[PDB]
Amino acid sequence: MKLSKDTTALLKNFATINSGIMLKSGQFIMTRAVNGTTYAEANISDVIDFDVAIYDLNGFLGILSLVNDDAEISQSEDGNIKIADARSTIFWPAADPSTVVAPNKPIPFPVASAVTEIKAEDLQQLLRVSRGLQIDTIAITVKEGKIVINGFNKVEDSALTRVKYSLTLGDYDGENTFNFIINMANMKMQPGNYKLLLWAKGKQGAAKFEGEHANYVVALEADSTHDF
Amino acid sequence: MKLSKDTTALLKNFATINSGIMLKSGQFIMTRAVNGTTYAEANISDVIDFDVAIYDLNGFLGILSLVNDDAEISQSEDGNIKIADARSTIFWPAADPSTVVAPNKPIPFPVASAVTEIKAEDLQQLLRVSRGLQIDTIAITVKEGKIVINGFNKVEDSALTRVKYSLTLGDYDGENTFNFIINMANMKMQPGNYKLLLWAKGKQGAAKFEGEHANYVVALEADSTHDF
Amino acid sequence: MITVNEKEHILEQKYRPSTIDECILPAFDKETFKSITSKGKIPHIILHSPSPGTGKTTVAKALCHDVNADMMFVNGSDCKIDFVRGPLTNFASAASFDGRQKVIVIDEFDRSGLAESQRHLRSFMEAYSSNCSIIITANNIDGIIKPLQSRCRVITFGQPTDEDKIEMMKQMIRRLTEICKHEGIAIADMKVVAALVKKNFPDFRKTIGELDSYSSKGVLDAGILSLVTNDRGAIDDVLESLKNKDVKQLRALAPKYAADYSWFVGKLAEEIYSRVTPQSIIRMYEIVGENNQYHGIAANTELHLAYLFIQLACEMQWK
Amino acid sequence: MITVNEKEHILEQKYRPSTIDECILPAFDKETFKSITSKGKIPHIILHSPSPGTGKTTVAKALCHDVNADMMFVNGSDCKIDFVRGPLTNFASAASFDGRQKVIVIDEFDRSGLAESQRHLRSFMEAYSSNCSIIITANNIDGIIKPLQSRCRVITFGQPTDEDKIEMMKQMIRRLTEICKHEGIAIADMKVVAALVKKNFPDFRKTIGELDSYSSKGVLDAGILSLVTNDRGAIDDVLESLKNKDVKQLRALAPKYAADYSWFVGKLAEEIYSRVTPQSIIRMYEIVGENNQYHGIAANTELHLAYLFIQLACEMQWK
Amino acid sequence: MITVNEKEHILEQKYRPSTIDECILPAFDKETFKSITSKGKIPHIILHSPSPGTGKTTVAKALCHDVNADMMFVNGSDCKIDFVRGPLTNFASAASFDGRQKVIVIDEFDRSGLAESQRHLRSFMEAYSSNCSIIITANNIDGIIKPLQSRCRVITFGQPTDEDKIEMMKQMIRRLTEICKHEGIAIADMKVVAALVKKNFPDFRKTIGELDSYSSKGVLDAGILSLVTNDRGAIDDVLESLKNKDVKQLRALAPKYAADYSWFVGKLAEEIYSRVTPQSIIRMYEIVGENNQYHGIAANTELHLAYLFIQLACEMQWK
Amino acid sequence: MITVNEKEHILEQKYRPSTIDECILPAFDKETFKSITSKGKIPHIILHSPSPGTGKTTVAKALCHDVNADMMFVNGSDCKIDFVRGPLTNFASAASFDGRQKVIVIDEFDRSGLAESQRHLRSFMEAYSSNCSIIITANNIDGIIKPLQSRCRVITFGQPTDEDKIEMMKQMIRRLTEICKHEGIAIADMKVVAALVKKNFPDFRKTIGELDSYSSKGVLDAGILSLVTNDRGAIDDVLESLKNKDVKQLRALAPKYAADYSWFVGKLAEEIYSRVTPQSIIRMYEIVGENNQYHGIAANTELHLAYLFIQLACEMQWK
Amino acid sequence: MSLFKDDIQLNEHQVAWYSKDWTAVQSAADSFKEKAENEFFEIIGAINNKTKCSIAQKDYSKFMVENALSQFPECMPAVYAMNLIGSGLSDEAHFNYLMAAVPRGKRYGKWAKLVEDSTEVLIIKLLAKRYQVNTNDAINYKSILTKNGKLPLVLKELKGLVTDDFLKEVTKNVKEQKQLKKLALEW
DNA sequence: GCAGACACTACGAGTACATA
DNA sequence: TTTTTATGTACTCGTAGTGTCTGC
Numbered sequence A, B: 001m002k003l004s005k006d007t008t009a010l011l012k013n014f015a016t017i018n019s020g021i022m023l024k025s026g027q028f029i030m031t032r033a034v035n036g037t038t039y040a041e042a043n044i045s046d047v048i049d050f051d052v053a054i055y056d057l058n059g060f061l062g063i064l065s066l067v068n069d070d071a072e073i074s075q076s077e078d079g080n081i082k083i084a085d086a087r088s089t090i091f092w093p094a095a096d097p098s099t100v101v102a103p104n105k106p107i108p109f110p111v112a113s114a115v116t117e118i119k120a121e122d123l124q125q126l127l128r129v130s131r132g133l134q135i136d137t138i139a140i141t142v143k144e145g146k147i148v149i150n151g152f153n154k155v156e157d158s159a160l161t162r163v164k165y166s167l168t169l170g171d172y173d174g175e176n177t178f179n180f181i182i183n184m185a186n187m188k189m190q191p192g193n194y195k196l197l198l199w200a201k202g203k204q205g206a207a208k209f210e211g212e213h214a215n216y217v218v219a220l221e222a223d224s225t226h227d228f
Numbered sequence C, D, E, F: 001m002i003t004v005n006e007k008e009h010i011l012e013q014k015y016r017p018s019t020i021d022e023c024i025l026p027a028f029d030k031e032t033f034k035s036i037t038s039k040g041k042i043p044h045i046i047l048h049s050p051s052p053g054t055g056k057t058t059v060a061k062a063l064c065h066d067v068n069a070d071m072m073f074v075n076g077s078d079c080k081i082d083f084v085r086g087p088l089t090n091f092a093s094a095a096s097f098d099g100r101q102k103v104i105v106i107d108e109f110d111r112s113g114l115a116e117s118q119r120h121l122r123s124f125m126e127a128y129s130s131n132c133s134i135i136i137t138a139n140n141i142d143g144i145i146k147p148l149q150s151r152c153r154v155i156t157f158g159q160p161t162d163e164d165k166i167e168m169m170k171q172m173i174r175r176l177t178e179i180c181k182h183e184g185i186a187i188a189d190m191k192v193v194a195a196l197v198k199k200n201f202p203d204f205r206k207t208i209g210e211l212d213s214y215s216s217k218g219v220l221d222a223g224i225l226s227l228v229t230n231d232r233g234a235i236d237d238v239l240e241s242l243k244n245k246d247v248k249q250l251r252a253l254a255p256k257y258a259a260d261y262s263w264f265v266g267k268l269a270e271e272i273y274s275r276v277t278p279q280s281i282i283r284m285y286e287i288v289g290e291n292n293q294y295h296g297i298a299a300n301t302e303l304h305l306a307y308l309f310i311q312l313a314c315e316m317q318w319k
Numbered sequence G: 001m002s003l004f005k006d007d008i009q010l011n012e013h014q015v016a017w018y019s020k021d022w023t024a025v026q027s028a029a030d031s032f033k034e035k036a037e038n039e040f041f042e043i044i045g046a047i048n049n050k051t052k053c054s055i056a057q058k059d060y061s062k063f064m065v066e067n068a069l070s071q072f073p074e075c076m077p078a079v080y081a082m083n084l085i086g087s088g089l090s091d092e093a094h095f096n097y098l099m100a101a102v103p104r105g106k107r108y109g110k111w112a113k114l115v116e117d118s119t120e121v122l123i124i125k126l127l128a129k130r131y132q133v134n135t136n137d138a139i140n141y142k143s144i145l146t147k148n149g150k151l152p153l154v155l156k157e158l159k160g161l162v163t164d165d166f167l168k169e170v171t172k173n174v175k176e177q178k179q180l181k182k183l184a185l186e187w
Numbered sequence H: 001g002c003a004g005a006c007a008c009t010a011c012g013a014g015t016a017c018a019t020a
Numbered sequence I: 001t002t003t004t005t006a007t008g009t010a011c012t013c014g015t016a017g018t019g020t021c022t023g024c
Ligand SMILES: Nc1ncnc2c1ncn2[C@@H]1O[C@H](COP(=O)(O)OP(=O)(O)O)[C@@H](O)[C@H]1O
Pocket: F011, F012, F013, F014, F015, F016, F017, F022, F023, F024, F025, F049, F051, F052, F053, F054, F055, F056, F057, F058, F059, F204, F205, F208
């Protein structure tokens, strides 16, 4: 079972969410942060043919990078993960499934309260502006009938009132008003086009970024407001 | 003496093996670790015209780094040494030969019990894999007619049973089965193509990596089994 | 009725209570925990007790189970300040998908080397106090810095009142019977279970561990009862010899109690106290304590015991 | 006229004063804070007190609310050197169009590891004193470097005069009555609130926390008074046994402190030190040290502690 | 039916038992270990004994071998906290594909400087306890913090019963006879073997080391018996010197009898009891016994015995 | 026969014996060292010699030479635990090139404050016992912890007999004659060297040091008129300081002899006995023995010795 | 310099911060440090004068306090009393006992030991390192070499052992910069 | 593209603590 | 006024060194 460049980049991105991943047989990988602030799934091309839990995903991907892209990954007779190369064989340890904080089932996202779309260029420039203006918070809200992501710097502006960035996403035809706050430290999405679904019910809330391959559910901040 | 870039890099590598080194007259330099677990030698192009003992080879090379390469190194009128290069003339002390630990005799490696070769890319892969997998011991052994380096983590595997890396070095074409366990802390060689000569007899044995620049003789670990 | 954890073979880990009702807690503590689960929002708590096994981690997890909290169990010694600045702050600032309350159980958070993280926490527990509470399990409350103890409900485990210690013991005896029945352990005598609870109290974990240890063949009998409570000998010959001031007899009997020196000397002091004027009881208390102080130092215990006997006989009074 | 944060649920965070008039500060401190707010500009202040919960963070936020300052709240442990060079300089250098005074509240900034970070701040004030003002709330004043104390106006909390102590205790009792009438808690006995204030003074946060802890059933009756005024865990029983030379009481209590030997010994010495003659002080410290040194050598730790009790009760002469 | 490790040449290391049956343990200790190996799952254990050589490391390795556990043997002094976070966590969080339990033998884990590391384990052993037990062998149990002692089955070596000491000595004599048969040591008489076993008991290793040391040529000669037995003889010369009150003779006879104070003082008490007036006998026990109770902390035992002789000459009357 | 390094400038470092035969030893000691050097491999050994200069370091290096072992000489004060984890472990775990057994000679491992390295060595000496033995040389073996004594075969340098004393005397004469021949020194009278080596017997290190100090003139005339405290084996400087009643000099001098308290206190008692009246002799016995009793519980040996010096200065009448 | 002849006369800190010259800002912020307050000598002196003091917020070291007080025999019976039994007592109780017990006196001075040298301690340390002998035997070797007259040869032999980080072992004060030249050429 | 920018790592200074 | 133990361990912070990715 080879891991292509795209699957390896996807798993490298997943390693920034959870340090280790319990990846099961099939073409589906999902991960959840240890504190449960950001969940992610992906339907990937390379078929996985054995259940294994990796306690250190970043190290596993580094070891994979050490050998060529033609390396054949399998389950060794010992039980570990045997990466076979032209002349080298590497036995990455398999973790106990209970020591890797992973979802038991893919969480079924509810019907979205507000649906919009953020393009790859817009997401890239939002991240770059975040690096530049030092904003660590965003708020997806409604302004003059359009859904806007407002980038605030929470460190100097605790009340989230001084808007440092403002990106218009698309038209909002609904009649509800909301302000879904998302920590930018929770936006661990790989660059791409994301359909942004947002769901809220009382104190419950989430924001799903549906990508072409990977979907990222992100937990809203505690001081989010809405009327859904 | 003039110390070129290659000889300076070789001396920097030798400085890891031993803190100091007695540079004897000629084109040959050698050193051994303080405890005697490893030995190194080299046939450098540069010619040494006077015996000198350096208690701090790291400091000597640090002094030589900022000064131009073509600097002339000689001995001072008062027993120290001097490095002169146009605008600079820096004096470095020369310690007593009996102060620093050097082999005092170039060890003649006996005829090898088994000769193989390890490529520069293979050695570099072994080193990076050892870093990534926390491998601390390797074992050069005979597996299915080939000569293989099996990397084990001795901390979690006291008896060296769980193989964590396996690198095939080439066909054996012999009749004796061995398992030469080398600590990875004893392998101080710089990157390059190496001819690996493993010698053993009774309870004595060693492994000599012969490179294009320097030869490193390392000592096998205690529980190295063979039948030579 | 009991909570059994299938994945655990350790007896004290297998039967770890999951609800507050299942915990063997004092009368007042259980009410202040059921009140917390009734309100539905855990305040900052510090469950601390010098004696391990009292139920701090069990209650900390059972609270988050009872209110259905978004527990993030964290090893205290792995809760360095870069962890508080990172995963813990990301946890506390965010709001859970399901709307459950967030609780950080910083278990065993009394290491001195973490005092630079606790100092970081004393504002963390105020900026994110409307969202995420903290339950700190500790063994010595002096390891939790005073500003942190001010922000939390400090609940001391393992110090029940006398009328409540006996209810703890009755509950623990009942729970040990249930554990024995679940584990296929036949109990022949309940006195051994009662004595096993008494010996290790309040260390309920050591109580279950010693229940496992004293049930190698899965049978608790009179032999186990003699083992748990020792009671190897009785003190009449020594007392009678001290009445007669028989130096040779005391010298001969000294090597007899050279094995269980502590039990013998304690029983001897207890027997002696009930049969002497109060004026001298002080004197031989001092003598016996002085003799016991150096027992781990003296080379010849027999000679140590002889010294004690003659000191007793010299400063002696039968009242 | 009370301030309620409907978002919060911890009682000691829900009712946090939003203004200086609402606080329970001493007469002098409240007067100087009122003068600062009336002047319109906050100077560099360092609100410090070793006792947590005196009101430092409350007073800082209340000042920045009273003068309508452009408060920037910082966790002090996050005010590292990059924070001073980064967000802090960005905040001080930005333009205040509204005319609101820029105030940087560096809460709990007494960490020693941030020594270098403080030096820069001391340099920072020399370059951005006109732009922004700095309020540093701290517990251990020795953690703030001396130059910062020299530049800033240091205000010590939690050491009120006797008249101030009486007045603030009265104010805290009144505020607790308001809190109880606001939380739907019926006050049966009015002395319970006074006991709560007196026991936890000057820690007001602990006062509100104990009020929430003891108001589990919504009624504060004489049972709550008994619980608050009677401190379980103290050595009053042991102390009265020692003064009475109660052999039986000391003998019975000796196994009660068997497990927690070191802490009990420390507390016992600390308590007795103030209630004996100087010569008795020397003698008691000698006995305590000598006994504690042989803690790991003596066999019977319970009999060891009984010996300790006997010696302490014997060789002591109360003042 | 013996275990031989051909790699080693140390006799106490070459013949280390590899199974619990081959170990020489008391009846109850061996029954506990056989029960543990029969259950198939090793719990957390602490094998502790102040006297070295009793068989702690042997029992830990044998428990790992009998259960067929995945064993990780780590020097305790190397098991710092960054080791528990690193290799230990990597080991405990590895898959058990073949069902082998993971046992982390932390040998000699009683160093004081590792207390912090131990304070990290007290939650480690609760998060990886489903399949990863910890066996801690230590010399003094006081070096293992109480929360660890609660989590582990604490088993004390080197304290057998009277009826079990003789059985263990007999088993040692048989094992030493087998060792001599294997090593090519031809024993002249087994009495010297019995003397070796009794002399170094319960230190079973110092026994095998002495077996090797007193077997230089390849045979245990009869003079070895007189060498190991020692014990000198009657001390009548010391008693006469005390009666003669000759200080120089007292200190000439002190060094030879100082080697074995723990008997020399017993012999002196048994002998000179009748050689002095009965009234002063108390003084002897007021002296000699007191002199003994300080033996373990006396730096120069030669000077301690000379001091004893000095007081005995000074404060005793001769009949 | 003699062995000369031809490089070292100190006679007691230049003429160090290279073989067990060349060492001047008692017949029994030389025989028990030959029984080890003739057996092939060396086990762990502890060379104990209370009297300085008998030659434990020389004997250890000679043992390593006779077996043809890869010695790694390490001073005890340079054997910190980070050295044992580093170069020592690297040394022991690897096999020597030419099949020579590795031996680590840890010199004066008892005279050090680093008892935390012995705890590491406890299991270091079992991990690599098939490849690397350890020879630990100790002044008083109470410094070496009990587990290391169980690991290591303890060889105590016995006191020479009369015949052995005479043989040592003649061997010392021959050795000094050859040293003086090789060092370019002409002997005036042989009785001079005989008296020198009788005066400094058995401290041959002191004799060689005195000869090397005298060697400036190139001739031996006085010999006995020695100064500069005559090495550390002599203690005359303490007696001179105590005679002057110089308390400050005693205070400054106590740290010099606090490293080896056990030998110093005995030597002090022996030397003071011959120099004082009998009444103050009996007083000094009580004082010195009282100070020796509490050495084990003494937190700091320097302060203990300083107090002993103060008591001796202030309570003795010199003679 | 300063092409603009009006200016506003910014101080060192304003110029350093407004220019974002973090080297100059670090230099200006380093101008405070103030390593001072001699916490120890106001405890011992207090003990010598029975003046009221509190160390609850302070840092107390039993070893240094006992060693300092041991210099004065009048207080030493107290010190010895804490040398045996004060190991288990808390720092607060240790100070309290030393307060209650040690008699008042006008006692001051310098610690009684070898009065440094930085010319003799280095020789002792170097001989101990080269010959692998303890400090006492190193003193013996140096005393022998001084009398014998071979000391300069030995110093010329082992002057190479003196290095950059070795001098820090000898002393903590900033004087080792001279020591590098002290044995620069023993000859 | 490759100088420049970002991330990871090792080391030194400083602090705190236990123990002898 | 009044010098500053030694060893081992753990944590935090600041910075310099090194390695890798990359955007007008
Ligand atoms: N038994 C001995 N035989 C010969 N020389 C000895 C003997 N003991 C000591 N020496 C002399 O002492 C020097 C070193 O002594 P050392 O072995 O260090 O004694 P210690 O360690 O007991 O002080 C050697 O150079 C040697 O000349």
